[PDB]
């Protein structure tokens, strides 16, 4: 077992892109001297993510806080290769406002560093736990100045980030609130934060076969048939929405994951409406949990549905932030 990003890019359908055969664009190379490493953000079985300060990484932000992914110093050569593969996948996908973007890398001599965007508020689970008891207000949704509109904002941005990944034929395969970070301005950023975890000793991951999988977040066809698609990501999106509107509850609370659980879900059991979900939001969840994958809504359609649940002025505010992101270099 080794660390590996869970994302997979579809090459063709009758086939996944082999990230080892992708090129590494040396334009991402950043001098190690320009990085000052700081405190740990998360530490897992194979490596860690740490805060850092990057000097001259951005012409517009010559001193910038970043996050840095790295392996333990004992990492085998096959483990380093997987970090290269993650680097190549991020280069291949390109940037979007609602993913944790690649900013640079140190690959030339010594340990491999992946330099990514830093997300001030951390992961969505901890953010919801911090602000659970608190549950120009509309204008302050997308700023640093909890309400139902905050939850709907998170819901919308994850759909836009996921719509982007799907447009690149990328399947996440571990979409969950622990893999959604919140950056400055309450901007949602989807990622794979697995480097910060030990899935062999994590109650969110369950021994199945020769590995540990996020079964409570997985569509039936992924559990039984090992089939992962953008439509199985949609199922996980519905489970993620349950996390959000339960303000950080664990899915299927009090239920143990075992053979009984798999067949129960397969037989049609679904989670009840979380306490702070509206009827419109719960109907979205129910649609995402269709047994037939092709009955599940696309992320493009999900973005359209959720946008219509938000104030009109929210959409303009989002596109101003999105415009700033596209113009910034």
Author numbering: 553 to 566, 573 to 693, 776 to 785, 790 to 973
Reproduce text from the manuscript describing this model.
In total, we obtained protein crystals suitable for structure determination which resulted in a total of 12 crystal structures: two apo-crystal structures and ten complex structures of KIT-wt, -T670I, and PDGFRA-T674I bound to avapritinib and to different ligands synthesized in our laboratory. Similar results were also obtained for apo-PDGFRA-wt and -T674I, showing that the water molecule is located near the gatekeeper in the case of the PDGFRA-wt structure but not in the PDGFRA-T674I structure.
Avapritinib is the only potent and selective inhibitor approved for the treatment of D842V-mutant gastrointestinal stromal tumors (GIST), the most common primary mutation of the platelet-derived growth factor receptor α (PDGFRA). Against this background, we solve the crystal structures of avapritinib in complex with wild-type and mutant PDGFRA and stem cell factor receptor (KIT), which provide evidence and understanding of inhibitor binding and lead to the identification of a sub-pocket (Gα-pocket). Furthermore, we report the identification of a sub-pocket (Gα-pocket) located in the N-lobe of the kinase domain, which is surrounded by amino acids of key regulatory elements such as the Gly-rich loop and the αC-helix.
